[PDB]
Amino acid sequence: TLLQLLLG
Amino acid sequence: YASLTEIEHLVQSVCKSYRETCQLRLEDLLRQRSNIFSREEVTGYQRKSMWEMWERCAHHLTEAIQYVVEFAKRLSGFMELCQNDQIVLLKAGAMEVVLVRMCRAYNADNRTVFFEGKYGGMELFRALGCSELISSIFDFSHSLSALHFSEDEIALYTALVLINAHRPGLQEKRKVEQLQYNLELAFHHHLSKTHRQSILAKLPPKGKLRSLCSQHVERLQIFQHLHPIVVQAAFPPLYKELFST
Ligand SMILES: CC(C)CCC[C@@H](C)[C@H]1CC[C@H]2[C@@H]3CC=C4C[C@@H](OS(=O)(=O)O)CC[C@]4(C)[C@H]3CC[C@]12C
């Protein structure tokens, strides 16, 4: 998900 | 069992994370107080199509959320939690932090918020077609302005807004409880030093922030059902991930 991506 | 030095370090670490992840300088916000939307400019916003206004607002809201994600990333202990629990806290808490952070952009004297360059009342947002939610948000910000928060206080408060062990679906709930408690210690420590513990009893009930967020999700449902293509084509994908059912 996008939240995962923004957190690395 | 965080020592007094650990707590003092946690205070400074939280307030630094916050200073570095604010989209707007507090000096600019007070400088632009006299800068208020005219009667002609308000009418222009009110005569925008629903889809356009929603699209604009969703973009600006997503932008603020990107800053909240950055705040979380620099927040002492947040990255120490497991991946799943980071997601859960951010997904539930991102909008809540923005709604709190809003009081920096809110003028109590004329009941206006800083939006797209100038200050305007809740009348600006009438084309959204969710006036109960908008006025609810303006009421919430008005109640926070009565508390006269300083930057450090908002920093410590928003940290507690984000790190909330009651969020459903937490895989390692106890680790979240420990960090939450330490941030409570950090919060109470700073307040007592400044003789400001009296605001704690005046803090909004935790169910009020949930209610505003529930209200936002519902108003998106109403809009997304009437305009499904707009959301799919134009809305920031993060906004859709966080708020769409
Ligand atoms: C329909 C749905 C989108 C309702 C939300 C409409 C309003 C209430 C939103 C849209 C755009 C939002 C702003 C976006 C961006 C910011 C900057 C942020 O600055 S910062 O320094 O705190 O990071 C403070 C909150 C603030 C002013 C938000 C308040 C809240 C805000 C006006």
Side-chain angles (χ1 to χ4, degrees):
Chain A
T1 75
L2 299 171
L3 268 184
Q4 295 163 13
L5 288 176
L6 290 159
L7 294 157
Chain B
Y1 297 113
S3 59
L4 184 59
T5 307
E6 288 182 71
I7 295 308
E8 282 172 324
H9 274 144
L10 184 64
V11 173
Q12 281 161 319
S13 175
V14 161
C15 299
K16 176 167 65 55
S17 297
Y18 175 83
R19 270 195 314 274
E20 297 174 346
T21 58
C22 278
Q23 180 173 11
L24 302 160
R25 301 262 286 173
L26 188 58
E27 266 63 81
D28 294 45
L29 289 158
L30 303 186
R31 263 203 272 103
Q32 300 297 318
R33 276 191 287 176
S34 59
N35 200 357
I36 303 151
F37 281 115
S38 70
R39 201 48 53 208
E40 292 82 24
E41 292 170 324
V42 168
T43 297
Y45 274 109
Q46 284 172 336
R47 274 162 203 191
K48 295 213 170 305
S49 60
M50 185 179 289
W51 67 263
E52 196 189 334
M53 196 53 185
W54 263 87
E55 197 171 308
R56 282 188 177 207
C57 288
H59 168 83
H60 300 313
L61 189 67
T62 305
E63 227 165 58
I65 292 168
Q66 277 164 284
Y67 281 94
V68 172
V69 182
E70 201 61 42
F71 176 70
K73 283 176 87 178
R74 303 183 186 206
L75 196 59
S76 191
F78 178 90
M79 293 311 288
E80 251 296 287
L81 310 164
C82 74
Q83 284 193 356
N84 174 86
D85 299 353
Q86 289 172 17
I87 305 304
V88 167
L89 293 170
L90 271 180
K91 195 173 181 190
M95 187 60 174
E96 277 181 30
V97 174
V98 178
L99 288 170
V100 177
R101 284 180 160 208
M102 180 176 152
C103 67
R104 309 170 76 247
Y106 181 83
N107 189 352
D109 298 342
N110 57 8
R111 290 149 80 168
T112 58
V113 72
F114 194 71
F115 176 80
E116 295 192 336
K118 299 177 199 183
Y119 280 92
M122 40 143 273
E123 63 208 287
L124 281 180
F125 307 89
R126 190 179 283 165
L128 296 171
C130 62
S131 53
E132 166 77 340
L133 170 71
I134 300 298
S135 75
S136 285
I137 288 160
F138 271 72
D139 273 343
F140 179 76
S141 215
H142 196 81
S143 72
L144 286 189
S145 66
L147 304 186
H148 306 279
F149 279 131
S150 63
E151 294 282 278
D152 291 356
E153 285 173 352
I154 292 174
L156 289 152
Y157 180 57
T158 53
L160 281 171
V161 166
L162 180 65
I163 314 300
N164 174 358
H166 301 107
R167 309 294 197 199
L170 290 173
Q171 276 176 14
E172 294 176 1
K173 184 166 184 158
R174 187 192 166 272
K175 210 212 272 172
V176 187
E177 279 154 357
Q178 183 63 237
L179 177 59
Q180 181 192 289
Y181 188 69
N182 280 348
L183 290 163
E184 283 170 10
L185 291 179
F187 196 34
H188 303 142
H189 177 79
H190 179 87
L191 288 171
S192 76
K193 275 190 157 191
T194 42
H195 276 246
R196 285 282 294 170
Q197 287 203 348
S198 69
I199 66 153
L200 286 164
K202 298 174 181 182
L203 285 175
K206 284 187 167 189
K208 222 284 146 60
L209 273 168
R210 268 200 315 274
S211 177
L212 290 178
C213 292
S214 296
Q215 216 173 139
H216 173 238
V217 168
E218 291 170 337
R219 299 317 294 207
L220 177 60
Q221 283 171 337
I222 295 167
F223 174 91
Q224 192 169 178
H225 282 133
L226 190 69
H227 298 107
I229 319 296
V230 166
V231 181
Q232 207 177 327
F235 275 36
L238 188 63
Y239 181 94
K240 192 174 131 287
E241 176 172 295
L242 292 185
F243 309 117
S244 173
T245 58

